[PDB]
């Protein structure tokens, strides 16, 4: 079902899995990047993420924000990034739950249009539906061809450890938040991983019995892929800060957080959302899906590509949104189908669920303090990190109690960035709250 492709950064462009791609925010600019199709619809561009930054932002005040302007600055570094992403995707598909996540992402193709598109119309000529591919075959006229895609993963922006998933907005509307879905993008760094100490076993523990852990970058990635899934199905939660008025037992921090993060994390985090707000979220998805089902009952033409088969795409979307059709061919929402799909998209894949299923230690809440990141020594070394078990390798006795992620135990696996990073961590681990 899901095949992870193999390639080396210096392999030649083949206009198939290795292409020159103009990413969505560069639509029409002619800025192309060497891009690698790691699986159907998913691309890796092993370049720093630069859109909306300035070049000086990448140079040189906060131990929780790590900068390195030289990350990815050679072809070999770009190759290391590609091989690491391949390994992480193989780890994701090594269990059924992450395989299912990838299948849902691949099959969750953006609708062919957005709110600007007439109801009767399929428009592929927009940045949230296609990216341009440059074709430069020797002895031929150079040309560009728009292709479909679902996700493009870049390397990091200025701060290596600030991974983020990004949707496309136009004139204050995001197709990824309005039922249609849209090409999703990510800035991701596998080696500079988060650290956390908001875990149940520290609750009531004496200071010197507290444990702190570093994250498995496959879980970091799968957390981001849940945001991707929401944005491909058009249900990323729009403009909804959730403001705690009390510190629950699983919370370490109490800052306001977007609801999109709380559902993506799972565990206990949605429990602080009011029933009223939770119901508004459900009603919005339903209203937006009703818009899509009405579009499918009207669509007659693809205005941007006379090779698109309308009936093939109508049925792809019928399946994506789990619509039903009557004897006459009219589509509609079936409430039972809708609730099942909604529950899978919003509650079926969470950071907490995935961590438990992969036996990866995670934080007890998205409401967790920022701690300094650490650098993994070498994710490509199977003595440190494997597809099957991540850091928590049985044959090293690192599976027990997630010892392979415990900063006080698996010191072979990671490096502190500086003495100041370590000192800050030690303060956080030793501190008494009254």
């Amino acid at each position, epitope marked *: 079902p899901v095949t992870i492709n193999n390639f080396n950064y210096n392999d030649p462009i083949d206009n198939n899995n290795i292409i020159m791609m103009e990413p969505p925010f560069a639509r029409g600019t002619g800025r192309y990047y060497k891009a690698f199709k790691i699986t159907d619809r998913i691309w890796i561009i092993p370049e720093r993420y630069t859109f909306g*930054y300035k070049p000086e932002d990448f140079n040189k005040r906060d131990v929780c924000e790590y900068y390195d302007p030289d990350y990815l600055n050679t072809n070999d570094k770009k190759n290391i990034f590609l091989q690491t992403m391949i390994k992480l995707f193989n780890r994701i598909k090594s269990k059924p739950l992450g395989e299912k996540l990838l299948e849902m992402i691949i099959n969750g193709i953006p609708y062919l249009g957005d709110r600007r598109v007439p109801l009767e119309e399929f428009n592929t000529n927009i940045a949230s539906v296609t990216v341009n591919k440059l074709i430069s075959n020797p002895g031929e006229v150079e040309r560009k061809k728009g292709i479909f895609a679902n996700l493009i993963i870049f390397g990091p922006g200025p701060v290596l450890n600030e991974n983020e998933t990004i949707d496309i907005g136009i004139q204050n509307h995001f197709a990824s938040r309005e039922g249609f879905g849209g090409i999703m993008q990510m800035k991701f760094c596998p080696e500079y991983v988060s650290v956390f100490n908001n875990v149940q076993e520290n609750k009531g523990a004496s200071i010197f019995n507290r444990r702190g852990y570093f994250s498995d970058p496959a879980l970091i990635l799968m957390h981001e892929l849940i945001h991707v899934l929401h944005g491909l199905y058009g249900i990323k939660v729009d403009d909804l*800060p959730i403001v705690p008025n009390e510190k629950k037992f699983f919370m370490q921090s109490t800052d306001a957080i977007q609801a999109e993060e709380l559902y993506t994390f799972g565990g206990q985090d949605p429990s602080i959302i009011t029933p009223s707000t939770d119901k508004s979220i459900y009603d919005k998805v339903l209203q937006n899906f009703r818009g899509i089902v009405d579009r499918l009952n009207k669509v007659l033409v693809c205005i941007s590509d006379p090779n698109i088969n309308i009936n093939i795409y109508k049925n792809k979307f019928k399946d994506k949104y789990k619509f039903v059709e009557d004897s006459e061919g009219k589509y509609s929402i079936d409430v039972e189908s809708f609730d099942k799909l909604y529950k899978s998209l919003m509650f079926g894949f969470t950071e907490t669920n995935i961590a438990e299923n992969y036996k990866i230690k995670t934080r007890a809440s998205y409401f967790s303090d920022s701690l300094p990141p650490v650098k993994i020594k070498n994710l490509l070394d199977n003595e440190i990190y494997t597809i099957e078990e991540g850091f928590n390798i049985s044959d090293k006795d690192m599976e027990k109690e997630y010892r392979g992620q415990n900063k006080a135990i698996n010191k072979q696996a990671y490096e502190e960035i500086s003495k100041e990073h370590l000192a800050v961590y030690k303060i956080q681990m030793c501190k008494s709250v009254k």
Partner: nanobody
Amino acid sequence: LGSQVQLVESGGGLVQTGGSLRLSCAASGRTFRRNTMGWFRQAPGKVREFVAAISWSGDRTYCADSVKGRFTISRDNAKNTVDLLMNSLKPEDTAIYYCAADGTASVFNSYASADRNKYNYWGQGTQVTVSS
């Protein structure tokens, strides 16, 4: 507690077409001296629309095309304020204006700064009405 943070917008009112207002937002409950701040506006029946944003140092501002040249955002970190000077107001500018803070201290990005989801603290808004 997130509920102890307050952004208070002020300076809204009624003006005639062509007039000017200066909105101001005072933050309390924590500092935002290393944080991007922005102004948004919401008209009846519409989404919260980006107006303008400003980096923590003021060295990087961004604003919507429809207000460029007429609206200026500025900030005074010592006084915990962010201001929006609105000149050449038109009826289309009528809306509730909101000031918003990105409570995570991260590098200003002009694209991210236009996204309401990148802000976790919001004021209750100040009404601006422009009549002909």
